[PDB]
Amino acid sequence: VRSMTLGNSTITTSANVVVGYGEWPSYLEDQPTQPDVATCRFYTLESVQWEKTSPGWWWKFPEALKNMGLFGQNMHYHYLGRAGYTIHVQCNASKFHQGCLLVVCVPEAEMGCADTDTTFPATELTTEDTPHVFTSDSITGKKVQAAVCNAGMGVGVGNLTIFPHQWINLRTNNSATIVIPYINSVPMDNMFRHYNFTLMIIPFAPLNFTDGATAYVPITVTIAPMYAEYNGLRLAS
């Protein structure tokens, strides 16, 4: 039950870590300044209530870390940047609870609008800290088509296991760890207008319990931006 510290933060943590595409995050006219101190500290988001009827959730990064301290602060100051995003998901469920989650990262998860003719106004995709829930049936309007069985992208939700993923089976384990080594074509991009990957958590087997147990299971997401670097503000020589 080793607990790892990192910065001024510490989290308590089946030590099975999934490294996205087998590559670990690394560094790299042009002059990048990298802040090793801070940024790397764990940023624990608010826990989500997983219930019998919960269809799913998704977060879009780096924009989900918009208000998370110095890392979000750096996003405003620096035009360009890149990071590595260790993600810890800890279900925290009792033995008498049953369920199964897919924790998957899906880089460049372009989503489709509900009303096909028109496009969504830029805030149906993402709010910073709060997740966006999926839906059980089709929806209409100028919001993202958030129906599971398609995961908002038009692909099947069953064969969405090709991305960096982890399975949380409350029977076996309650934890997940995924490492996402900055997948992008350009070496640096603007964090505000570009979403590198979309952490979405989808229950394949729904939560179930008997009448005495707690009606929910709170899922906690923790993000540590690893090897974050930006552009150089100061003049070259």
């Binding site: 933060s9 510490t10 989290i11 308590t12 998370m68």
Partner: peptide, 18 residues
């Protein structure tokens, strides 16, 4: 808030583990 407490010196203590 819990968010402002998370943005500082803190330790997330898992009660079921330890």
């Amino acid at each position: 808030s819990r968010k402002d407490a998370m943005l500082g010196t803190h330790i997330v203590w898992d009660i079921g583990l330890q």
